Design a protein around this ligand. Structure first.
Ligand SMILES: [Mg+2]
Ligand SMILES: [Mg+2]
Ligand SMILES: [Mg+2]
Ligand SMILES: [Mg+2]
Ligand SMILES: [Mg+2]
Ligand SMILES: [Mg+2]
Ligand SMILES: [Mg+2]
Ligand SMILES: [Mg+2]
Ligand SMILES: [Mg+2]
Ligand SMILES: [Mg+2]
Ligand SMILES: [Mg+2]
Ligand SMILES: [Mg+2]
Lengths: 159, 293, 170, 205, 48
RNA sequence: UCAACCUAUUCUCAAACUUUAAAUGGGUAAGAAGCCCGGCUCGCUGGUGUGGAGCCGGGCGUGGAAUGCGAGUGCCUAGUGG
RNA sequence: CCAGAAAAGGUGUUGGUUGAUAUAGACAGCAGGAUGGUGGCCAUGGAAGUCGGAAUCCGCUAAGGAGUGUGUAACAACUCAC
RNA sequence: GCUCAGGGAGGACAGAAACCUCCCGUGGAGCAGAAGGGCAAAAGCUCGCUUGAUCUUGAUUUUCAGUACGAAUACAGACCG
RNA sequence: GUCUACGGCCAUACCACCCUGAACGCGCCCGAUCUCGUCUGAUCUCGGAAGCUAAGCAGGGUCGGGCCUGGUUAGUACUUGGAUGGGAGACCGCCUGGGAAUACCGGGUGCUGUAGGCUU
């Protein structure tokens, strides 16, 4: 049976990617995190202080507490039957913002702007993202030439 | 023979440093421990008083870090000391003190805190720390950035530090590495530091040279002779410089002269030019070979 | 004509005596080359233990010193005047440096003492050029650049042009 | 005392080689892989015939050497002593394990190393014979006799490549006349148009 | 008398019978684990 | 000459090798608890009614992908654990 | 699933690929030649094409191999290529 | 404050290997141990000063029943280096 | 056009060699009295300005190595789901979707933030 080590099975998971070992870049240390920010976890082997556990590598949570070097975040960890909204203290360089909220934030700013606009203009605009519809009818122009005839090649053993 | 160390597998597996570490200019260990504001401060700026001693002047800046770069709020150089009265000797300890005082009073003029926080008007060379007063807006506090200067005692970095502290910046320091602190008994007499702030080691060396050997005196000091600076008017000249700096520390910008747009370096050769070069080289090689045949 | 910042000058003349045992004869040889150079030398300790030579780890086995400047040129000139101003071209390294050895130290001009004895020395000249300080300066370290290096031929031409020595082959 | 190869015949396990973990492996049966005058240029043997496998199976080192000697004997009989080049293109790396009983049973069942076995894919070349272009039938016949030393189904394919090279046999001598290919023994060197042209002019000198 | 060791066979079916339901997040989450100096500041700002 | 060595090539591999690197898969987001203003409180943070946080007050509905469906919650508990 | 079979073969039979040679008259079949230098050289005890090691060309030729086999102490004799 | 493993060229005895000098050197060294990760103006080596290996209440992670112990993670109140 | 100081992303920036650098800079450089530190003012620290772009550095070049980005390899390898498909098996073919990596052949060779110069 397997050992229950804290870092068991993380040979390739906390290791630094190829040719980017070395000193941590400092924008990582300069990014500021409010509370309630959606934030991704990705642990990193260069700093062992404040290591997130291997259950959380690649999970996304929400900041509730910011200390002077670390943030506390609430992640959903799935254990056997239930999903636990549990809170962990991660030091600042194992963590990075998520753009998954930012795309929605751009969309809510844009559609609230085009709801402010085109209200007194009488028109009614589409705001719900309809899915990718079937392609409507269209003429394919064969400009002159015949379509090329394709037919399967005879078998030759190349090896 | 020998195994080629710098082979193609070496250049595949090679990893560069950072650019400023390859160029050697910055120290990322001290820079990381120096500039990173605590995360609960929530985008509060954290200021460095950067001192850099060059061979011919002294850069004194203050800066807070951002993710796209360091924003320099206020700079003060040593080559703008002839504006205030130090005509020559721009890289000594006294010029370091003067440019620290200039950076200090220039920032306080930018922030509107000149009449508040006077600091050391007359110099002493003793320990001083700007204690912030109630009711008025508080003191500006910044931390020293020395870079790669090996901070032993009597460093011109700490001369510019004392200049900024006497100008009125709440910089945390101690009088361990100002000149005067004897290492054997571990105390600090302020009068040696006052002599170094007023350049009296330079004046004593000048009197030493003009007493013992005159052509070596002209060899060592010549621009002092051309700007006719004698050792006796030295500290009075620096006091006049301090009075003029604490009087009017604003920086007026040099006006931008309009360019004539002349390029001084050879521009980047294009694809057609370099493939034409190798076509000409192959043609010239084969014709030289066939007429050498 | 040529740019005067490429004049081949000496950077250091470094001397050692490796006596291979600590204590009496090592301090004796330290007094020897201090009497030679005029400055207190340093003691080089043995790196690894070998039983074949009778030296152990961290045992002081050698005495060395480095001399700069005019007295380095003087000590070099007296070492060459006992080596008769002649050198084999095997003595010239790839980086333009060279060196030789004297077998007994009375020959340089110091007077014999029977409590002292004799000692052999290695002299080694590292040459230079005005501008080699960027390879070991602290703040902005750079490599020396390819046309500023000193080669074997350019070093031996310097020797046989400046000290008027002869380079016997082999 | 060696077990039949029908035991150790299918690619049953993950590849388990002679390494820092499997110590005490007995050495492979085959150790010679090239035969004939292997000191021959690319120019003097154009023709190349491949025994290519057609089932994903496991060949043993002893079977590799048996088929090697079977082809070598026939071609030194037929094409002369010094007129071909046999290459065996499978080196045995997967080692195989043996649980011997002497009464413990299946308790602690993990085998000592017994032998080495090559793992072969659909379409991998087992043997390849390079010879002159009129000794084509002797290549076919030698590889057909060497088939019977292996399990499974193997087929024979005379390639369109010039000998033991990755270049096509018709355009080979054209490219060696146009000097994109340089002879360096049993192989050939490919010269791109990407080097410094001091190498170009040293070729065209 | 051996008996088998570990299994996770019927477990996912057992879980999804009552359903794996997400933790019901509710407005006004609590304040345990917050930096206590920040929380002193918050309690005085609420006090005054 | 024959070896080692060095430089370009070449044959075959790796669960405890790896520059690359899928498919399937795993988190988060897809709003009214959200935006946008205005003003107070702070002993925390502070060049700077700075920064953050907590409050009050007001205005915004086209409920912001598809599909499908009533949900949430608390007790007591048998059998099972080859 | 699943309850029995492989390598290897077949001028049984059916399709398919590739290459030959044939009205300058092929493949069978039946008949006629299958010769000189020469019994080529080493070699063997004897090796006359016919056990063996390398060679392995000419004359005359419509054609004949310094020989495909049966043989012979070895020639003779037969047979084949052609 | 320095740079390591290894290699090249030199230099009295000295050599395959004692010591000195230069040059190359992305870690091929070292970090107490098993291995994996991590690390170059360092986490390695050499120095200087020391005792945060200390006093104290909570929170959290890890195994987990989401209980202990062990180990660990950010804080907070002192006293310190 | 460009440099310095502090930088962000950290090779499109590295590495090897060669050519050219006006101006201000940046350097090499000249020294050891004071501060400081060494066997040695070589390094570190300090006081300067006679000389010089020789080197660093900057710009450019190399049918350059590398790196970055494409094309090919290839709808190949692998693959989600499916069959009372084939095959004695090993394995393979088809349907429904997804879909790579070398070798080989092209292109590119730092962008840029704040402050301060220079190009009168
Ligand atoms: Mg430091
Ligand atoms: Mg049996
Ligand atoms: Mg198995
Ligand atoms: Mg059982
Ligand atoms: Mg059980
Ligand atoms: Mg350190
Ligand atoms: Mg000097
Ligand atoms: Mg230069
Ligand atoms: Mg130059
Ligand atoms: Mg290239
Ligand atoms: Mg810039
Ligand atoms: Mg003009």
């Amino acid at each position: 049976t397997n050992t229950k080590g804290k870092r068991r099975g993380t040979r390739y998971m906390f290791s630094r990617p190829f040719r980017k070992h070395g000193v941590v870049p400092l924008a990582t240390y300069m990014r500021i995190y409010k509370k309630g920010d959606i934030v991704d976890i990705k642990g990193m082997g260069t700093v062992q202080k404040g290591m997130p556990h291997k259950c959380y590598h690649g999970k996304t949570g929400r900041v509730y507490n910011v200390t002077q070097h670390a943030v506390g975040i609430v992640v959903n960890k799935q254990v056997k039957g239930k999903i636990l909204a549990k809170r962990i203290n991660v030091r600042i360089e194992h963590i990075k913002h998520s753009k998954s909220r930012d795309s929605f934030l751009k969309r809510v700013k844009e559609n609230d702007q085009k709801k402010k606009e085109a209200k007194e203009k009488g028109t009614w605009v589409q705001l719900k993202r309809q899915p990718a519809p079937p392609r409507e009818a269209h003429f394919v122009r064969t400009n002159g030439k015949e379509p090329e005839l394709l037919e399967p090649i005879p078998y030759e053993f190349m090896a | 023979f020998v195994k080629v160390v710098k082979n193609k597998a070496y250049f595949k597996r090679y990893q560069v440093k950072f650019r400023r570490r390859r160029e050697g200019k910055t120290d990322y260990y001290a820079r990381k421990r120096l500039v990173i504001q605590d995360k609960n401060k929530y985008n509060t700026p954290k200021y460095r008083m950067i001192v850099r001693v060059t061979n011919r002047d002294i850069i004194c800046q203050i800066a807070y870090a951002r993710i796209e770069g360091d924003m320099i709020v206020c700079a003060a150089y040593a080559h703008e000391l002839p504006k205030y009265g130090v005509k020559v000797g721009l890289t000594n300890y006294a010029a370091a003190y003067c440019t620290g005082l200039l950076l200090a009073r220039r920032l306080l003029n930018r922030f509107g805190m000149d009449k508040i926080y006077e600091g050391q008007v007359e110099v002493t060379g003793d320990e001083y720390n700007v204690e912030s007063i109630d009711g008025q807006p508080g003191a500006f506090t910044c931390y020293l950035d020395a870079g790669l200067a090996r901070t032993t005692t009597g460093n011109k970095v700490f001369g510019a530090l004392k200049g900024a502290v006497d100008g009125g910046l709440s910089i945390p320091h101690s009088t361990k590495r100002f000149p005067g602190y004897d290492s054997e008994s571990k105390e600090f007499n302020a009068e040696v530091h006052r002599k170094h702030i007023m350049g009296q080691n330079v004046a004593d060396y000048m009197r030493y040279l003009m007493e013992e050997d005159e052509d070596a005196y002209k060899k060592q000091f010549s621009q002092y002779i051309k700007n006719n600076v004698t050792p006796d008017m030295m500290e009075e000249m620096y006091k006049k410089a301090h009075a003029a700096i604490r009087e009017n520390p604003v920086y007026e910008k040099k006006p931008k002269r309009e360019v004539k747009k002349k390029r001084w370096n050879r521009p980047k050769m294009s694809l057609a030019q370099k493939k034409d070069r190798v076509a000409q080289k192959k043609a010239s090689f084969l014709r030289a070979q066939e007429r050498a045949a | 004509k040529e740019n005067p910042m490429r004049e081949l000058r000496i950077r250091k003349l470094c001397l050692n005596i490796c006596v291979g045992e600590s204590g009496d004869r090592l301090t004796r040889a330290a007094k020897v080359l201090e009497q030679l150079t005029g400055q207190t030398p340093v003691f080089s300790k043995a790196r690894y233990t070998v039983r074949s030579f009778g030296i152990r780890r961290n045992e002081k086995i050698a005495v060395h010193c480095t001399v700069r400047g005019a007295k380095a040129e003087e000590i070099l000139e007296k070492g060459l005047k006992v080596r008769e101003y002649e050198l084999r071209k095997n003595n010239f390294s790839d980086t333009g440096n060279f060196g030789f050895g004297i077998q007994e130290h009375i020959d340089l001009g110091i007077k014999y003492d029977p409590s002292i004895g004799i000692y052999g020395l290695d002299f080694y000249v590292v040459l230079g050029r005005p501008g080699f300080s960027i390879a070991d300066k602290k703040r902005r370290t750079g490599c020396i650049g390819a046309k500023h290096r000193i080669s074997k031929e350019e070093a031996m031409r310097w020797f046989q042009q400046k000290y008027d020595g002869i380079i016997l082959p082999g | 005392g060696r077990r039949p190869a029908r035991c150790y015949r299918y690619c049953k396990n993950k590849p388990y080689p002679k390494s820092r973990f499997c110590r005490g492996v007995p050495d492979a049966k085959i150790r010679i892989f090239d035969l004939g005058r292997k000191k021959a240029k690319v120019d003097e043997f154009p023709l190349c015939g491949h025994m290519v496998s057609d089932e994903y199976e496991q060949l043993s080192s002893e079977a590799l050497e048996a088929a090697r000697i079977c082809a070598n004997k026939y071609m030194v009989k037929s094409c002369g002593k010094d007129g071909f080049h046999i290459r065996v293109r499978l080196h045995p790396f997967h080692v195989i394990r043996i649980n011997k009983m002497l009464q413990t049973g299946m308790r602690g069942a993990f085998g000592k190393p017994q032998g080495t076995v090559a793992r072969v894919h659909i379409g991998q070349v087992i043997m390849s014979i390079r010879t002159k272009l009129q000794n084509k039938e002797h290549v076919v016949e030698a590889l057909r006799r060497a088939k019977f030393k292996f399990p499974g189904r193997q087929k024979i394919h005379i390639s369109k490549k010039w000998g033991f090279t990755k270049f096509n046999a018709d355009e080979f001598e054209d490219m060696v006349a146009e000097k994109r290919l340089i002879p360096d023994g049993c192989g050939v060197k490919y010269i791109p148009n990407r080097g410094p042209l001091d190498k170009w002019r040293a070729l065209h000198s | 008398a051996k008996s088998k060791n570990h299994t996770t066979h019927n477990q996912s079916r057992k879980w999804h019978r009552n359903g794996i339901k997400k933790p019901r997040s509710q407005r006004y989450e609590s304040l345990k684990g917050v930096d206590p100096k920040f929380l002193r500041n918050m309690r005085f700002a609420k006090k005054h």
